[PDB]
Chain A
Amino acid sequence: FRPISVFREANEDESGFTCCAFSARERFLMLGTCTGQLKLYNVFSGQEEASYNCHNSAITHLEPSRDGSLLLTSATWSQPLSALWGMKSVFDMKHSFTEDHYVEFSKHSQDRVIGTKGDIAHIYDIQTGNKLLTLFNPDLANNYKRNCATFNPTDDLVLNDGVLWDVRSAQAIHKFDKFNMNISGVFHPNGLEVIINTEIWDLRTFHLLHTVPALDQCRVVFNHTGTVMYGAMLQADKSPFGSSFRTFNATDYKPIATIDVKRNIFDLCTDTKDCYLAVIENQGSMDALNMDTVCRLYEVG
């Protein structure tokens, strides 16, 4: 991971980048900020290219669609907590999701949005914005404190609060036991395993395939071939993450690298080609008290 570029937020005395994703226009990165703005930056020069007002509180997370036409944002406390933005030509709001504090696109065909409100999953149509489905069963809930509902790669299954749902029938097909307080888990890109905190469960049998202690309290992202997994640990009970992330072999979960940037991390992402890793790093001497973030661009060897 060779450092390639660094930049802080233009015009601002305290730099307030909070999250990032590469845009479809290569060389440009989209960043959310602590004032609810969405900004476009040239990642090599550090030049701010555009700024938009998306939310009345800090942006926590964002996701661009693969075709570059749409963007999901989530804020901290102000409603709407999440929104869908059109990026073709004019930048404008398409839909808003009032109470969903976290949203993702569907994965195969990006025609739906899945939102999370506490223990509950909401599925929306991108065109109409209508709520198509609510997935929640109080008897099966695990009540994960940082529950995030998510589609599997072919969009036919949902993982919500440690419960696996069949989307077409809107039926819970399996509840995974609760072994931590916060993390509800994600699908592996191979479509055949789920990663729920330290537990790798087989979707063919529900057997425990792996125990991966290093994944405790981690959020993860995969490179686009599905061969490497990045993981960074949430800060427990301020920056969302600690100062290190780790790479893992995506097939056997054996560690590859441990990278300690010595600054607390707010977000990271990679480009479609996996040439680059962008990381939001806090320079602040007392973590998020005096938040002062930079974006570092690293070369993926």
Chain B
Amino acid sequence: VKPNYALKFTLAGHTKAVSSVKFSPNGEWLASSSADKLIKIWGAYDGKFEKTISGHKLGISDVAWSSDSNLLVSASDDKTLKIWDVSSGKCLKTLKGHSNYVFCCNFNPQSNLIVSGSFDESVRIWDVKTGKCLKTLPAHSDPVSAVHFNRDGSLIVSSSYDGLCRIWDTASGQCLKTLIDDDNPPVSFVKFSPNGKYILAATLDNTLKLWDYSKGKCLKTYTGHKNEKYCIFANFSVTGGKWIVSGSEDNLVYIWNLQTKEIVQKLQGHTDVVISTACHPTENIIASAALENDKTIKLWKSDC
């Protein structure tokens, strides 16, 4: 089988490139961040605009939800992250410490920590409740493109323009693994699989790879899309068929059969790089977002 994602809504409102879209874990909301310095919240099922959250001084690279859908964290060119109470829209904490643009962020599942990655080549771990930096990891020797906790919060994975993925012990900050294949093109994206067994990593050679990170083995390779310049977010789609989903620099959403590596769908409609995609936690719904020449978010729905 193949999915049959079709376009349901186009969300317009950001006035610059849209950098990141994330579904709330409770499935009710979509959050978006933008180069326009704004976070916007949208209804996940009807695409209806809900509110604008503001405070960052420069463009926002990434946004992420707390496990209970009540908080957001954002990562900004202004060198800070901000923790937000979504219902009130207020900035609860500003995390200061990085010496250059912050590109990526995430809560742990417990939601008492935030992990961040930066142009300054560090990964930082922050106390959600104090807003204080708990650890600074000398993670990489080039800018950090993604950071993600595993399902029990004991591990952090990071990816960098230095060509490496690295896995870190949350508690000690120790590096526990460096993944590298037969070459080291910039690693533009990484995340753990939902079950925590694998990581999915994008490299700027038009390639996605599924890794057994314990065994240090590449298990699947996905190609056919265009990805040589931008750090495009990818996903496991697990609500229906088992897919891999990623944006592409030819302005399409690509969907692959996880097991067979075959392209099963390409979603057409955006007019610029599709730099972010997200998969709804319970329904077969995809959100995509595109760069400056497009500025829109699209919601897509599939029967499987």
Rounded to whole Å, the gap between the CB of B164 and the closest CB of chain A is: 15
> Is B293 part of the binding interface, using a Cβ–Cβ cutoff of 8 Å?
yes
Rounded to whole Å, the gap between the CB of A299 and the closest CB of chain B is: 38
Write the A69-92 contact mask toward B (1 if CB under 8 angstroms, else 0): 000000000110000000000000
Rounded to whole Å, the gap between the CB of A13 and the closest CB of chain B is: 12
Task: Tell me, in angstroms, the Cα distance from A206 to B293 when the chains sit together.
Answer: 49
Write the B129-163 contact mask toward A (1 if CB under 8 angstroms, else 0): 00000000000001000000000000000000100
Q: Give the chain B neighbours of A78 by CB distance below 8 A.
A: 142, 161
Write the A233-249 contact mask toward B (1 if CB under 8 angstroms, else 0): 00000000000000000
Rounded to whole Å, the gap between the CB of B187 and the closest CB of chain A is: 13
Q: Give the chain A neighbours of B142 by CB distance below 8 A.
A: 78-79
Task: Tell me, in angstroms, the Cα distance from A78 to B293 when the chains sit together.
Answer: 25
Q: Give the chain A neighbours of B186 by CB distance below 8 A.
A: 56
Rounded to whole Å, the gap between the CB of A159 and the closest CB of chain B is: 28
Interfacial residues of chain B within 254-304, with CB under 8 A of chain A in the complex: 292-293
The interface on chain B, measured as residues whose beta carbon lies within 8 A of the other chain's beta carbons, has a size of 5
Among the interface residues B161, B186, B292, which one has the most CB atoms of the partner chain A within 10 A?
B161
Task: Tell me, in angstroms, the Cα distance from A78 to B162 when the chains sit together.
Answer: 11
A79's nearest neighbour on chain B, judged by CB, is B142
> Is A50 part of the binding interface, using a Cβ–Cβ cutoff of 8 Å?
no
> Is A173 part of the binding interface, using a Cβ–Cβ cutoff of 8 Å?
no
B141's nearest neighbour on chain A, judged by CB, is A79
Task: Tell me, in angstroms, the Cα distance from A118 to B186 when the chains sit together.
Answer: 27
Rounded to whole Å, the gap between the CB of A224 and the closest CB of chain B is: 39
Interfacial residues of chain B within 230-251, with CB under 8 A of chain A in the complex: none
Task: Tell me, in angstroms, the Cα distance from A194 to B292 when the chains sit together.
Answer: 41
Write the B34-68 contact mask toward A (1 if CB under 8 angstroms, else 0): 00000000000000000000000000000000000
Task: Tell me, in angstroms, the Cα distance from A79 to B161 when the chains sit together.
Answer: 11
Task: Tell me, in angstroms, the Cα distance from A289 to B293 when the chains sit together.
Answer: 9
Interfacial residues of chain A within 145-173, with CB under 8 A of chain B in the complex: none
A290's nearest neighbour on chain B, judged by CB, is B293
Interfacial residues of chain B within 181-210, with CB under 8 A of chain A in the complex: 186
Interfacial residues of chain A within 238-294, with CB under 8 A of chain B in the complex: 289
B186's nearest neighbour on chain A, judged by CB, is A56
Rounded to whole Å, the gap between the CB of B160 and the closest CB of chain A is: 12
Interfacial residues of chain A within 49-68, with CB under 8 A of chain B in the complex: 56
Rounded to whole Å, the gap between the CB of B172 and the closest CB of chain A is: 29
Task: Tell me, in angstroms, the Cα distance from A289 to B17 when the chains sit together.
Answer: 13
Write the B106-145 contact mask toward A (1 if CB under 8 angstroms, else 0): 0000000000000000000000000000000000001000
Rounded to whole Å, the gap between the CB of B223 and the closest CB of chain A is: 20
Task: Tell me, in angstroms, the Cα distance from A289 to B271 when the chains sit together.
Answer: 13
Task: Tell me, in angstroms, the Cα distance from A118 to B299 when the chains sit together.
Answer: 44
Write the B167-186 contact mask toward A (1 if CB under 8 angstroms, else 0): 00000000000000000001
Rounded to whole Å, the gap between the CB of B192 and the closest CB of chain A is: 27
Q: Give the chain B neighbours of A56 by CB distance below 8 A.
A: 161, 186
Q: Give the chain A neighbours of B293 by CB distance below 8 A.
A: 289
B121's nearest neighbour on chain A, judged by CB, is A79
Rounded to whole Å, the gap between the CB of B184 and the closest CB of chain A is: 12
Rounded to whole Å, the gap between the CB of A232 and the closest CB of chain B is: 26
Q: Give the chain A neighbours of B292 by CB distance below 8 A.
A: 289
Task: Tell me, in angstroms, the Cα distance from A217 to B29 when the chains sit together.
Answer: 47
Q: Give the chain B neighbours of A289 by CB distance below 8 A.
A: 292-293
Task: Tell me, in angstroms, the Cα distance from A78 to B292 when the chains sit together.
Answer: 23
Q: Give the chain A neighbours of B161 by CB distance below 8 A.
A: 56, 78
Task: Tell me, in angstroms, the Cα distance from A56 to B142 when the chains sit together.
Answer: 11
Write the B16-28 contact mask toward A (1 if CB under 8 angstroms, else 0): 0000000000000
Rounded to whole Å, the gap between the CB of A175 and the closest CB of chain B is: 28
Task: Tell me, in angstroms, the Cα distance from A78 to B204 when the chains sit together.
Answer: 15
Task: Tell me, in angstroms, the Cα distance from A79 to B141 when the chains sit together.
Answer: 10
A57's nearest neighbour on chain B, judged by CB, is B161
Task: Tell me, in angstroms, the Cα distance from A185 to B186 when the chains sit together.
Answer: 37
Task: Tell me, in angstroms, the Cα distance from A266 to B187 when the chains sit together.
Answer: 30
Task: Tell me, in angstroms, the Cα distance from A289 to B272 when the chains sit together.
Answer: 11
Task: Tell me, in angstroms, the Cα distance from A244 to B45 when the chains sit together.
Answer: 52
Rounded to whole Å, the gap between the CB of A280 and the closest CB of chain B is: 21
Task: Tell me, in angstroms, the Cα distance from A79 to B119 when the chains sit together.
Answer: 11
Rounded to whole Å, the gap between the CB of A95 and the closest CB of chain B is: 19
B293's nearest neighbour on chain A, judged by CB, is A289
Task: Tell me, in angstroms, the Cα distance from A78 to B161 when the chains sit together.
Answer: 9
Rounded to whole Å, the gap between the CB of A215 and the closest CB of chain B is: 31
Rounded to whole Å, the gap between the CB of A241 and the closest CB of chain B is: 22
Task: Tell me, in angstroms, the Cα distance from A79 to B143 when the chains sit together.
Answer: 10
Task: Tell me, in angstroms, the Cα distance from A289 to B292 when the chains sit together.
Answer: 9
Q: Give the chain B neighbours of A79 by CB distance below 8 A.
A: 142
Rounded to whole Å, the gap between the CB of B17 and the closest CB of chain A is: 12
Rounded to whole Å, the gap between the CB of A44 and the closest CB of chain B is: 32
Rounded to whole Å, the gap between the CB of B271 and the closest CB of chain A is: 12
Task: Tell me, in angstroms, the Cα distance from A289 to B142 when the chains sit together.
Answer: 26
7 A–B pairs (Cβ distance < 8 Å), ordered by A: A56-B161, A56-B186, A78-B142, A78-B161, A79-B142, A289-B292, A289-B293
Closest 7 CB pairs of A and B: A289-B293, A56-B161, A78-B142, A78-B161, A79-B142, A289-B292, A56-B186
